Nanobody, 123 residues
Framework: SQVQLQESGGGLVQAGGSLRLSCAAS????????MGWFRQAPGKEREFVAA????????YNADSVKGRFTISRDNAKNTVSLQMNSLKPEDTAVYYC???????????????WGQGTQVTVSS
């Protein structure tokens, strides 16, 4: 059928607080190349956040992450966590999980997307 990227761990938190985003793939099974997170603040462009490859290679939008966030592969099939610390009101955005398929030619490219989950960081 279809690939579904189920996102959780979001919600409301106070500035300086933490969140642990989780993305678990369901539906049609696929061999993942890379899984990561994107986000879109109100009235702004959707931007990259973090990603981990199936080899364990990690990359970050360091200019916005600033070493605060840590992505990692979970034990389960196509499951990824994003540990977000020291959150600020500018981190308030809709966060999208994205997954890359090995069966799709582009290397470390993203093919499947989650519906998005809300993250709101109060002052």
């Amino acid at each position: 059928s279809q690939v579904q990227l189920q996102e959780s761990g979001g919600g409301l938190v106070q500035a300086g607080g933490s969140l642990r985003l989780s993305c678990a793939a369901s539906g049609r099974t696929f061999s993942s190349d890379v899984m990561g997170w994107f986000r879109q603040a109100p009235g702004k462009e959707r931007e990259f956040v973090a990603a981990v490859t199936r080899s364990g290679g990690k990359s970050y939008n360091a200019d916005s992450v600033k070493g605060r966030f840590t992505i990692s592969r979970d034990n389960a099939k196509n499951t990824v966590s994003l540990q977000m610390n020291s959150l600020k009101p500018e981190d308030t955005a809709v966060y999208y999980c994205a997954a890359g398929d090995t069966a799709i030619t582009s290397w470390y490219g993203y093919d499947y997307w989650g519906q998005g989950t809300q993250v709101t960081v109060s002052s």
